[PDB]
Amino acid sequence: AEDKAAVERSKMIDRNLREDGERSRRELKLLLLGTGESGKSTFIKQMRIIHGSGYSDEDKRGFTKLVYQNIFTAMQAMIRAMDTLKIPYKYEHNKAHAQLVREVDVEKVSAFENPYVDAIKSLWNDPGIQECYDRRREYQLSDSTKYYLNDLDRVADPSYLPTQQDVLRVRVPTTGIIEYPFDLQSVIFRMVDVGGQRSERRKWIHCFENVTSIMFLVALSEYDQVLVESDNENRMEESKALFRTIITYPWFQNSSVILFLNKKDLLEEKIMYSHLVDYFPEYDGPQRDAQAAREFILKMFVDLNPDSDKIIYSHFTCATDTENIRFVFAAVKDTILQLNLK
Amino acid sequence: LLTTXXAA
Amino acid sequence: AEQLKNQIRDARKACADATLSQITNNIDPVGRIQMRTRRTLRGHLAKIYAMHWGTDSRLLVSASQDGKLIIWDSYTTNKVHAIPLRSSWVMTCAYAPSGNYVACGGLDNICSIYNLKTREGNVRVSRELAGHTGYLSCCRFLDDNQIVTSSGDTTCALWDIETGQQTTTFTGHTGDVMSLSLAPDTRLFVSGACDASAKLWDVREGMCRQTFTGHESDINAICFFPNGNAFATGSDDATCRLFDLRADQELMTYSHDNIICGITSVSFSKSGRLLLAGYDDFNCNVWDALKADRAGVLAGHDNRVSCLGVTDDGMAVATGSWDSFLKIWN
Amino acid sequence: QARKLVEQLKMEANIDRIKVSKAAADLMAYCEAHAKEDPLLTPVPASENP
Ligand SMILES: Nc1nc2c(ncn2[C@@H]2O[C@H](COP(=O)(O)OP(=O)(O)O)[C@@H](O)[C@H]2O)c(=O)[nH]1
């Protein structure tokens, strides 16, 4: 007899297959969603810190390149804004430093060389550019630009090693899907991220039919951002639309919803000057109050849910805060286990 | 997945 | 500058003298098509998105959101290979004509080639084909070292596996590219996208030869007619449609009242006379290519049919569903 | 700021062209000459077990 070569093999494949559908049902897919620059990536990063393999010296170096990258992007946007808000430079020499930095190959940055340090430091000193930074609420610019740019010092030195904080802030250009697996001792979690998808959602959204959980994210600091090029669109009114559409999907019925209200530390910092009312006429409460504003924002967002039966479990978060998340997430953990154990 | 991250 | 666009509309109109309907009319229609399930491929644990036949018309690959890609013995039933994919978010598979490699991609934007029959432990990840900024729509080899790919980021790309490099990029689409199909000779491919219009491309030269409008919505499926001078398109607008390259225009629309669900897949029959399509309403449909009649149906799935596959010897059909099942029809 | 599509229109209008009648007939004839070779269109005997 000469047969059953891969017939006998097919037996042992169903063996592995059943063991792997067995393990994978215990995986809890937690889909991160929310607009641009609203905290998802950072969250994932925090998970690797509290519940995962950390960022050891080696792991860190792999970011050095990205640190540089951000800076240029940060500066690059800043430069555009100048010619959009019609703000000129205080110092003449800097206009050359702009052309210099304009032509910078968005992505090709190996090291952070001397001619580029000055170019950028020079500009960071220009009272036009700082004024542009002071009006970042119009156009879109990363929220930790100041962080790095007030540190050009260390970032540009030869023997430079980044640290957790830098790590927690670099824009890490996402090819497409970001999935991260980890576990609370007995249970395994699998975070999901699709922010860096340069395509239409309506062709792949259904790939997420009844996942364990949805974690939706709003930036609180977002309330007063408008984007003049993008025709004065309120950046948080924008996020309200994503969420409304996200919250009406049939795909997500069985999926528990969590609303992270992120960039809170940035909220009450700024709620003292910018006023919530003259951006959302309906706002009724006091001024110069974080708590009143959080509660309000959390309401317009929850209001977008059509039907009693589906409870949203929100939290207030600072995604840069390692101990905040460490403590916020335990709550989520429970309200997921307690809620999906039946 | 990246780029490490995930793992990586 | 743009009424030059309103010039091919005179060209294709002067080319129109008779319809494909008018001509295929006094020819007798199709005999009778009622295929029954010849096999049920059972092994995936979540919904399957793509499948592709091997050139031997017997072995085939699947691609399921279960993070497992599977090689099947279609005649028998036996699983030959199971691929533990790094990303369970896959959206297509490929079968090398040689059957030495197998490609697959998805929301990762990495076209993963897999070295099949080997002397390695089991089956290894061979190549990383990275360069796309959106989900991997579909893919099919030209040989063991070149593959055309189409993706969400509105572009299709021809690669060189050996070196893993972007050989030539085929840009021209507005909406996402959903589909692709090589011509018989692999001299030039057709690709359907969410711009509601497919494109005929020249493989080596790069540039887009002909653009084809028609559908009032997203194409998800495209298909080269056996001889290589026509193609089928499967769209959300619920119509299948026919285009001749040499005529440079639509010849047939496989509409139908009372059906309104989208179409995920299209694949012709050896002769070209049958258009097998796969639908949202869990039903596959068998169309008279020439007459525009609805011959039969492959009703047999519980969820929508995500992909089709017709054999090279045209004696069998695979259908792939979101119900984690494949069925062979005869 | 935009110009580059106007090009494609010239590359697309200037190509080969064929009257539908011939286009339909040719590919109707291909079809006709492969019918008996199409197992799904004219069933091969039942002892074609696959
Ligand atoms: N102060 C503060 N900074 C934040 C917070 N959340 C995110 N950031 C920072 O602002 C930037 C936002 O990027 P990211 O978290 O990746 O947003 P996403 O990728 O669009 O979801 C990152 O550099 C973060 O380090 C927050 O709650 N508070």
Side-chain angles (χ1 to χ4, degrees), chain A, chain B residues 1-3 5-8, chain C, chain D:
Chain A
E2 309 92 330
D3 48 298
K4 268 167 182 163
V7 192
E8 176 53 40
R9 196 191 185 187
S10 181
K11 180 211 188 195
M12 218 217 95
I13 295 299
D14 318 335
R15 192 153 283 106
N16 310 132
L17 271 163
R18 212 215 80 252
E19 291 158 28
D20 291 326
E22 162 198 60
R23 262 168 277 274
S24 290
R25 60 150 207 270
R26 184 70 288 178
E27 87 185 276
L28 296 189
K29 32 272 147 184
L30 316 164
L31 211 194
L32 292 189
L33 300 142
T35 31
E37 224 81 327
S38 64
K40 302 182 291 293
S41 132
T42 313
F43 196 97
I44 314 188
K45 317 184 99 166
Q46 290 275 202
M47 301 284 78
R48 193 182 146 153
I49 303 180
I50 323 153
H51 290 239
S53 279
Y55 298 93
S56 186
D57 308 335
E58 304 88 329
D59 305 281
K60 291 197 184 193
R61 188 216 272 174
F63 287 92
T64 56
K65 194 195 288 290
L66 295 136
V67 177
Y68 304 157
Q69 227 106 23
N70 277 248
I71 291 176
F72 295 81
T73 73
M75 187 43 81
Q76 195 183 108
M78 213 118 61
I79 307 300
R80 308 268 144 78
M82 297 264 78
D83 300 71
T84 319
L85 287 306
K86 290 183 271 284
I87 313 160
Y89 302 88
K90 196 262 201 289
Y91 298 121
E92 192 65 7
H93 336 92
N94 284 282
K95 266 187 272 168
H97 289 126
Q99 269 305 118
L100 272 46
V101 128
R102 202 93 108 279
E103 277 100 79
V104 171
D105 331 63
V106 194
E107 196 298 303
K108 222 265 265 203
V109 193
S110 320
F112 195 37
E113 303 281 56
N114 261 10
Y116 294 92
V117 187
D118 295 314
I120 307 164
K121 174 57 177 180
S122 167
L123 284 163
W124 196 223
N125 288 20
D126 200 277
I129 282 294
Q130 288 290 322
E131 131 99 309
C132 165
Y133 178 74
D134 286 327
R135 268 170 82 169
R136 80 200 90 102
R137 64 159 208 81
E138 270 135 317
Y139 71 93
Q140 268 310 292
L141 181 92
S142 172
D143 268 344
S144 49
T145 60
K146 194 83 151 280
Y147 169 67
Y148 297 119
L149 286 172
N150 290 358
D151 248 314
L152 278 143
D153 307 283
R154 50 164 199 135
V155 172
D157 98 80
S159 301
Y160 154 72
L161 188 79
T163 32
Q164 220 144 296
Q165 186 96 120
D166 298 300
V167 177
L168 283 145
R169 315 190 98 110
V170 264
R171 183 68 275 165
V172 267
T174 85
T175 170
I177 192 175
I178 332 300
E179 51 166 309
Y180 180 76
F182 67 92
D183 59 311
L184 163 92
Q185 281 205 190
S186 35
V187 41
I188 337 102
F189 292 84
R190 190 178 285 271
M191 316 274 305
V192 165
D193 192 338
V194 281
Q197 182 65 219
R198 186 82 277 274
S199 69
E200 233 283 26
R201 330 263 135 180
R202 70 163 193 268
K203 310 298 291 194
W204 51 264
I205 187 61
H206 45 77
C207 292
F208 303 102
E209 200 134 311
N210 306 304
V211 295
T212 328
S213 223
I214 299 302
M215 289 170 298
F216 195 81
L217 285 79
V218 187
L220 279 157
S221 62
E222 194 78 329
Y223 72 100
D224 66 352
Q225 261 70 6
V226 287
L227 282 153
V228 290
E229 317 94 313
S230 215
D231 206 303
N232 255 330
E233 177 179 33
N234 184 283
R235 271 251 75 177
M236 217 179 64
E237 197 41 62
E238 206 172 341
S239 194
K240 283 179 71 208
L242 177 59
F243 183 76
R244 184 211 164 277
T245 316
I246 206 111
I247 205 72
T248 54
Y249 284 144
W251 327 105
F252 299 140
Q253 143 51 25
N254 303 336
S255 181
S256 68
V257 196
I258 289 153
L259 186 58
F260 284 145
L261 282 211
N262 207 31
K263 308 204 175 191
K264 64 175 296 327
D265 66 303
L266 292 178
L267 170 59
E268 86 291 66
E269 177 202 299
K270 81 144 76 176
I271 194 56
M272 304 301 268
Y273 41 106
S274 201
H275 290 304
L276 185 64
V277 253
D278 40 49
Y279 282 80
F280 294 105
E282 67 173 314
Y283 181 53
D284 210 303
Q287 309 173 120
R288 299 189 176 199
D289 190 346
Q291 283 63 243
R294 302 198 316 195
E295 284 157 38
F296 174 85
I297 282 142
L298 183 63
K299 215 72 194 184
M300 345 171 66
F301 267 92
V302 158
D303 285 341
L304 298 161
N305 180 308
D307 80 326
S308 212
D309 297 302
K310 196 44 186 300
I311 303 309
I312 303 162
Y313 314 69
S314 53
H315 303 262
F316 299 117
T317 70
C318 172
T320 58
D321 204 328
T322 296
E323 255 281 322
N324 186 225
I325 306 305
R326 173 161 37 210
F327 265 79
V328 163
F329 185 68
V332 160
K333 182 181 79 73
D334 306 359
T335 36
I336 285 175
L337 308 181
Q338 293 172 13
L339 195 63
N340 214 285
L341 230 153
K342 203 179 195 70
Chain B
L1 273 256
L2 190 354
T3 356
Chain C
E2 49 283 299
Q3 55 281 156
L4 177 65
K5 181 204 288 167
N6 200 60
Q7 208 105 34
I8 317 173
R9 71 100 180 184
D10 282 64
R12 297 166 178 173
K13 198 77 170 193
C15 261
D17 56 339
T19 57
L20 193 262
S21 314
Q22 271 165 305
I23 301 158
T24 59
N25 227 129
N26 317 132
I27 48 141
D28 307 292
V30 181
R32 157 155 133 258
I33 308 304
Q34 72 179 63
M35 294 169 274
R36 278 158 173 81
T37 282
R38 217 97 292 174
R39 214 144 271 95
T40 311
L41 292 185
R42 199 222 196 293
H44 276 307
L45 292 166
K47 45 182 67 148
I48 319 162
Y49 281 43
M51 61 74 47
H52 202 240
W53 281 105
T55 310
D56 67 334
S57 287
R58 203 266 194 87
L59 282 152
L60 77 117
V61 284
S62 61
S64 161
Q65 228 68 188
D66 68 334
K68 303 287 193 157
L69 180 138
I70 310 174
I71 286 87
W72 308 84
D73 186 306
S74 74
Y75 289 177
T76 315
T77 212
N78 314 136
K79 309 191 175 82
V80 154
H81 289 120
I83 318 296
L85 318 162
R86 21 55 76 81
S87 172
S88 41
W89 309 96
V90 290
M91 223 143 307
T92 203
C93 49
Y95 224 151
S98 50
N100 311 349
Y101 298 98
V102 154
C104 93
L107 296 164
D108 42 271
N109 318 352
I110 304 292
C111 177
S112 293
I113 326 286
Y114 298 99
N115 214 319
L116 275 185
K117 325 256 207 171
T118 56
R119 270 88 188 92
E120 297 113 56
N122 300 134
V123 165
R124 201 59 35 245
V125 186
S126 193
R127 259 277 168 253
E128 285 293 299
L129 305 197
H132 268 294
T133 81
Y135 64 90
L136 208 140
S137 217
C138 64
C139 65
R140 33 218 44 168
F141 295 84
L142 298 92
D143 54 9
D144 288 275
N145 214 44
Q146 276 200 27
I147 185 159
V148 174
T149 62
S150 66
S151 111
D153 62 9
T154 94
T155 61
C156 317
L158 172 66
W159 307 67
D160 176 344
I161 288 97
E162 162 108 45
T163 190
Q165 221 74 280
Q166 189 88 337
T167 276
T168 23
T169 316
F170 314 99
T171 71
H173 280 301
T174 93
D176 302 352
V177 190
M178 293 309 286
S179 203
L180 80 83
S181 178
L182 297 340
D185 52 29
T186 81
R187 289 269 210 164
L188 64 194
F189 76 82
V190 289
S191 57
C194 302
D195 54 0
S197 40
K199 284 173 184 283
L200 173 72
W201 301 87
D202 189 294
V203 172
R204 317 295 171 169
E205 313 295 321
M207 55 257 281
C208 176
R209 280 201 155 188
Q210 296 152 229
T211 322
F212 292 108
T213 45
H215 301 281
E216 200 178 305
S217 184
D218 284 25
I219 299 179
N220 301 262
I222 213 170
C223 178
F224 248 112
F225 176 100
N227 65 19
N229 275 135
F231 66 86
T233 49
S235 162
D236 280 356
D237 67 338
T239 64
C240 271
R241 296 179 197 216
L242 198 59
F243 299 85
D244 194 320
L245 316 170
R246 277 147 58 245
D248 189 40
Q249 55 201 122
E250 190 184 297
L251 308 182
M252 198 81 269
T253 294
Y254 306 89
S255 83
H256 198 280
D257 306 6
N258 307 303
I259 303 169
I260 313 274
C261 80
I263 301 156
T264 72
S265 51
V266 280
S267 182
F268 263 111
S269 70
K270 300 263 278 104
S271 81
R273 197 49 198 268
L274 312 165
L275 185 41
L276 299 94
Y279 282 63
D280 281 353
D281 69 356
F282 330 140
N283 277 189
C284 170
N285 269 304
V286 177
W287 282 102
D288 191 328
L290 286 163
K291 293 269 277 182
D293 297 304
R294 195 194 190 181
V297 50
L298 312 180
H301 280 285
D302 212 307
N303 208 306
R304 54 173 87 154
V305 179
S306 43
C307 50
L308 275 157
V310 170
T311 59
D312 274 5
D313 62 31
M315 215 201 83
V317 198
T319 46
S321 164
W322 278 6
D323 67 38
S324 80
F325 283 122
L326 292 142
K327 271 156 172 169
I328 307 305
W329 310 76
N330 234 189
Chain D
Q1 318 284 352
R3 177 186 174 163
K4 214 154 194 172
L5 181 74
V6 198
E7 178 81 51
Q8 257 278 143
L9 317 180
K10 202 184 176 185
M11 268 194 280
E12 219 166 301
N14 265 61
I15 65 149
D16 66 310
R17 228 160 297 275
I18 266 162
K19 235 83 173 165
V20 174
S21 51
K22 197 162 85 178
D26 282 3
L27 313 198
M28 182 178 84
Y30 169 87
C31 215
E32 277 262 344
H34 288 102
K36 204 261 140 200
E37 270 185 45
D38 189 5
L40 316 176
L41 167 65
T42 50
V44 282
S47 290
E48 282 81 330
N49 342 84

